[PDB]
Write a protein that binds this ligand. Structure first.
Ligand SMILES: NC(=O)c1ccc[n+]([C@@H]2O[C@H](COP(=O)([O-])OP(=O)(O)OC[C@H]3O[C@@H](n4cnc5c(N)ncnc54)[C@H](O)[C@@H]3O)[C@@H](O)[C@H]2O)c1
Ligand SMILES: NC(=O)c1ccc[n+]([C@@H]2O[C@H](COP(=O)([O-])OP(=O)(O)OC[C@H]3O[C@@H](n4cnc5c(N)ncnc54)[C@H](O)[C@@H]3O)[C@@H](O)[C@H]2O)c1
Ligand SMILES: NC(=O)c1ccc[n+]([C@@H]2O[C@H](COP(=O)([O-])OP(=O)(O)OC[C@H]3O[C@@H](n4cnc5c(N)ncnc54)[C@H](O)[C@@H]3O)[C@@H](O)[C@H]2O)c1
Ligand SMILES: NC(=O)c1ccc[n+]([C@@H]2O[C@H](COP(=O)([O-])OP(=O)(O)OC[C@H]3O[C@@H](n4cnc5c(N)ncnc54)[C@H](O)[C@@H]3O)[C@@H](O)[C@H]2O)c1
Lengths: 231, 231, 231, 231
């Protein structure tokens, strides 16, 4: 049992959760998280109804559901040249003081889209209401089994989000003649994506573990924290 | 093994499968079909290499996935007054020479959003590439197990497509105080919705049955039928 | 100075202005109105501080901008068979118990896109916050001089809203080979469109006349009527 | 008369054009540009029908139309702390190895939207078919008079593009507690946007000059170069 702060417990926020989640996954030990004042999505609770929280983790009140989390590898011609993971997503991204980045999205070996773009977001349903949400994404209910593909500012006619089945092979091909790209996962863990390389995102063998205290619907979080006028 | 035209076999189009597959639906027997010149999505075989198909119908060579399908009934407080099912999706539609239709959208029995609109769409993943796509909805992998909610011309701040978990219950309550609506199922099977009714879609217990001949990736159908510019 | 209810004065709603403003339209005399409790966009005055308004109607204190309005006629090869005008917009709409409507979209007499759909919308900038908004269209500043094209539930790769120059001619040719459609004007004034017709909208020579009482910024209307979350 | 390369003439592409355009504006001298093989939007011609090009610039075949171009100022409390311009746009942007950037969009002194975001794109109609296009933007016909406001990946419920009248005051307020932001214009001319600062985009007194050789419709460029299936 462990704590990361301002079974796994975390007392802070979404930023700290995906920080939490990293090891909690790593150690196949269910993560648990509670808000510390600052409003954030992923946190099952606020820092106000506390005692019950801790108590329930001692009284053993929660569950662990297989949240899709993704494994990312960059490989240089046959040759895996880098590996990663993320609870939220794998953000393919261009440098900042740079221009449009050339990229090919292939799913299950068919290239579904090519374009110039800020980058590509392949996100879990678990993180469907983040950046991918930012990029026009649909909301995915955390318990789905699927992969979310949402391009980042694509100079293209077609960039409609695609949601494929949990078992497919998403590939971003980085143009040779172009620039080194970037990958960040859940906000951290940058890696370099050399031009000519090729991203490849897939489901990771070990999903992370999500400790539900209130076994209530996503619909209850989603409206309250986003402030949906359900009028 | 029956034949239908514009084991189940059909020589027509999308509405011929929905017609064909309609009857087979009750007769538990997997649907299979050939597109008829003019672009048709769900046809595993086309109006060009039709003959060759036959073999799979004679040797009975293909496989069947239980595609998520949806069950719908309109109810006025505890009184289920009608039910429908769908291959593509279930569109609630306002009267035809009418105006915006009054609405509150509930998911998980939780109200997510209220508004006037053309209406709201509830789709099977396979229907995400039909009406829902046109109406602003994302692409879902056909083999998915999940439900898609797309509001139809919603005079709203937010009408983002929602991809729900198959273990859900989507319900739209129709304004009593206003006009009676319409509901369609696979675009066919229209039904009349009393003002004040409550729409309610859920994962259908009896999937449709699919005759897959050539086990290629969905990205190959999606590309040609949609003619995706990987330009 | 005439009064209409759910100088031109009205005590109703958006469709009461469109009704009121309708007749005044021929009578060249600026429209002015008060919203009636339930949210109404175009009302420069509301159902709360109504009385105070009056002054501007008695002292005749306000000003008039010539809001771009549009002229529409349906023609079958050189034969203009009907015409309409609009405050908000001009929606081509498919038959009501029908299916997708066949279409080629031409702007500047150049074909930009073809498809089936619910239909296509042509709007005055003031109509961009009405149907066109709901149908996927952007917000245009009301005082604009420009025309907005928004396709309505278009089974297409690309149906991006188009904001054209007022010095243009937008034309949608309706499939002959298929079904007859419908066209509306301010949602009212429906017209029947023969299959094969050719829709043609252009900058209307005779703008509507606007009675602006309180010279505030449009962002103040837009915020309250829309209730924009600057949260 | 002057040339920038691989009255103003330019022989290269869109990248070089907005490079061209900078001074050509600066020296109130109409810009003119011709493709040099590499496909790009803004260039009136290709490097294949050349002689006529040059010739027409000597025979004086073209025109100069007042393309909206924008003036940008960043000011530190009353105090203008930096000024800019751009033919395309003013891109408000967060650092790259950073997180969501806090920002308030006010038009004509009413704050229309606040959110966390990659940044804000305020673009001319002249550049409507670029990044703003990337960010979900509508296409604006170059000759319009308007300002385009398109947020860059906003963690917000509402980020609908807004098109206001040419004479309004767009303001992005950079949160104090946040991070220094960035501005790039047409790809160049970076400037630093300190937290607590406040962006302010407006029409620049001197529009740039666009030299039309073929006085044809935008619709002709737009379909050909984008490859619109107008089928
Ligand atoms: N929308 C954008 O422009 C943007 C900026 C970069 C990062 N992000 C997301 O933020 C996450 C990291 O956050 P940060 O601490 O680095 O701060 P940040 O400045 O990058 O902003 C992140 C915001 O998104 C929220 N968030 C994080 N993960 C989420 C999720 N899965 N679902 C819903 N909301 C979530 C956080 O609470 C915070 O409000 C990344 O995993 C990425 O998904 C999106
Ligand atoms: N686009 C719209 O706004 C709209 C309006 C009416 C109904 N529909 C759709 O019509 C479908 C039934 O089609 P129909 O054969 O009766 O003809 P139709 O005249 O209603 O037009 C259907 C169009 O959608 C295509 N289509 C049908 N199912 C599809 C699928 N699952 N994936 C991709 N494309 C598909 C057909 O090829 C055809 O081009 C319904 O499932 C509904 O989704 C769409
Ligand atoms: N949302 C849709 O899919 C849809 C379908 C039918 C027609 N319409 C719109 O209906 C409008 C006429 O409205 P109605 O009074 O006859 O009632 P209605 O029953 O057709 O609903 C109109 C709704 O749009 C609002 N509205 C009307 N004009 C507006 C404007 N210019 N800006 C912002 N909001 C506006 C009204 O307040 C009302 O909420 C037409 O101009 C058309 O744009 C929209
Ligand atoms: N879509 C994106 O993700 C993205 C990336 C950054 C820059 N841009 C745009 O590109 C421009 C600068 O181009 P760059 O040479 O630095 O290369 P770049 O790598 O930034 O890509 C720019 C692309 O946009 C095209 N372009 C530039 N201005 C345009 C316009 N006004 N309308 C239509 N297309 C245009 C260029 O031809 C090129 O294909 C900037 O002004 C900005 O508008 C957009």
């Amino acid at each position: 049992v462990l704590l990361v702060v301002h079974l796994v417990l975390v007392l802070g926020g979404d930023g700290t959760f995906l920080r939490a989640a990293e090891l909690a996954r790593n150690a196949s030990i269910p993560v648990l998280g509670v808000n510390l004042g600052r409003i954030g999505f992923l946190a099952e609770a606020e820092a106000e109804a506390i005692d019950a929280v801790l108590e329930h983790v001692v009284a053993q009140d929660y569950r662990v559901e297989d949240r899709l989390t993704l494994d990312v590898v960059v490989r240089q011609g046959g040759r895996i040249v880098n590996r990663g993971w993320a609870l939220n997503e794998v953000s393919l991204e261009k440098g900042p003081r740079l221009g449009v980045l050339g990229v090919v999205v292939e799913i299950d070996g068919r290239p579904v889209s090519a374009f110039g773009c800020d980058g590509v977001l392949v996100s879990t349903p678990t993180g469907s209401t983040a950046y991918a949400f930012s990029a026009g994404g649909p909301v995915l209910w955390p318990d789905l089994e699927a992969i979310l593909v949402v391009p980042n500012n694509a100079h293209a006619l077609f960039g409609r989000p695609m949601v494929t089945s949990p078992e497919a092979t998403i590939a971003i091909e980085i143009e040779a003649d172009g620039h080194d790209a970037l990958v960040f996962c859940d906000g951290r863990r940058e890696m370099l994506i050399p031009a000519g390389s090729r991203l490849e995102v897939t489901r990771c063998v070990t999903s992370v573990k999500w400790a539900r205290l209130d076994s209530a619907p996503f619909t209850d979080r989603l409206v309250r924290k986003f402030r949906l006028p359900v009028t």
